[PDB]
Nucleic acid binder design. Sequence first.
DNA 1: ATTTGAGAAATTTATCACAAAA
DNA 2: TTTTGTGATAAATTTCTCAAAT
Lengths: 203, 203
Amino acid sequence: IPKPVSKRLVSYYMCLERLLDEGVEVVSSEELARRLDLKASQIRKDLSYFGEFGKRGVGYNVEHLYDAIGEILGVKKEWKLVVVGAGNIGRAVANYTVMKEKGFRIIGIFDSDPSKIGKEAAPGLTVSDVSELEKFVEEHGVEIGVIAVPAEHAQEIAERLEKAGIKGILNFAPVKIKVSVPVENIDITASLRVLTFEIVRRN
Amino acid sequence: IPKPVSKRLVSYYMCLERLLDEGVEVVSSEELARRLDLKASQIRKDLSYFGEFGKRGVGYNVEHLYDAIGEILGVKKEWKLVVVGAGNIGRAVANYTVMKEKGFRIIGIFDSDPSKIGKEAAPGLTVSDVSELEKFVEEHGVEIGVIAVPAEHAQEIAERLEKAGIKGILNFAPVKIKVSVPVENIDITASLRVLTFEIVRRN
DNA sequence: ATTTGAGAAATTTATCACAAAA
DNA sequence: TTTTGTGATAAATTTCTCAAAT
Ligand SMILES: NC(=O)c1ccc[n+]([C@@H]2O[C@H](COP(=O)([O-])OP(=O)(O)OC[C@H]3O[C@@H](n4cnc5c(N)ncnc54)[C@H](O)[C@@H]3O)[C@@H](O)[C@H]2O)c1
Ligand SMILES: NC(=O)c1ccc[n+]([C@@H]2O[C@H](COP(=O)([O-])OP(=O)(O)OC[C@H]3O[C@@H](n4cnc5c(N)ncnc54)[C@H](O)[C@@H]3O)[C@@H](O)[C@H]2O)c1
């Protein structure tokens, strides 16, 4: 499966949830492409990699395709997350997941600063000492670790998660993590610098 | 300019700053590829698009190439940013830029909630009423707007920024913004769902 | 002795076109 | 009356060679 497909699959997934909220039961690839700003052929091709969910001369059943993509994306289950780093980013993600997301459940947040190791970072979430990270991940079968520590300590924390059996890592620190589990990176500063690149190109 | 180049250029830029902090004056493309986990040929190709910064049989002057990429990225200037939305994401980005970044200066943050209007979101940064957004952007020549409002209000905020002369937008809301200025998106939930995709694929 | 950079090839991704179903 | 889905084309991206500098 081509690399850019997974990203577009997530976009189709959110769009289908919107159509369900609107009451739409059937949608064509051209109607989907019209509101995502993509070519209908690309949408049909990407879905081709995983199966035949369409009805020739009719379209796609919104609920069936939504459920199908959800199964492919692994979203049909609840994912247990831990946040390492109770700073700006760590608390922002903790307060959001507990509130807005129902498929991702943050059950722990960790820090190394004695001032924060006792404070509450989100509703029903008390900051734990990072010394307990491995024990917590193994005991509660945590599956996703979000790294929100400075770059100088991201790799070390990444290896502890992988050692404790983490299945994947969401990395916010501006460094390339080296581990055997999947890693998605969110580099805010890199995005700004990609933005300035495009800005000066237009000028 | 191929699409993936700008992203890798930002990666070379951070790596070169690290080499400067280490005292390295000259570096080969193979040494750069060694610390970025890329092929040396790719690094040389990407640099080819913008000029000839290397010394045949020698390598690249670290400081000269750093300055060259910095000029291409548009980082040799100070960029004025405003944050719309003083929530979790908005406050996290405000406190970081004011503290950690020297090339991006957040000079304003805006919200529509009377409870937060007037409050301080970061050192020396007081939340302003979003009704003043356009006026602020025009007067102070703000160049980059960071959108940290719920998805239902992202497009409307994007159009006000573009109307006030904003040059680019960093978008955190899970929706595709439609404007004539460049837009870089950071979709945290989409990243998690791309991560779950990779997790269930491997296993 | 090395190491960059300019074609050329190889690889990957997007787009098209149309028969096949409903 | 139409729209999905498969092959094939087309386009974009990555990788490879190696002459030319040093
Ligand atoms: N906040 C932003 O907008 C932003 C922007 C760009 C990049 N980043 C990057 O995201 C990451 C976190 O950003 P932030 O704003 O939250 O910084 P922050 O200083 O507010 O929070 C970092 C937290 O990590 C803790 N920490 C440090 N070492 C630790 C360790 N071994 N174990 C456990 N905890 C540890 C610290 O106690 C601190 O609380 C950083 O790598 C940063 O470079 C953030
Ligand atoms: N916090 C996360 O980790 C996370 C994760 C996924 C997605 N997001 C998305 O990022 C965006 C912001 O996230 P958040 O956690 O900070 O939400 P938040 O509730 O913590 O803060 C959002 C702020 O936007 C303000 N607002 C609403 N409408 C406004 C308007 N017209 N003008 C000005 N201000 C307005 C609100 O007063 C609020 O303070 C959202 O779109 C969210 O879906 C965030």
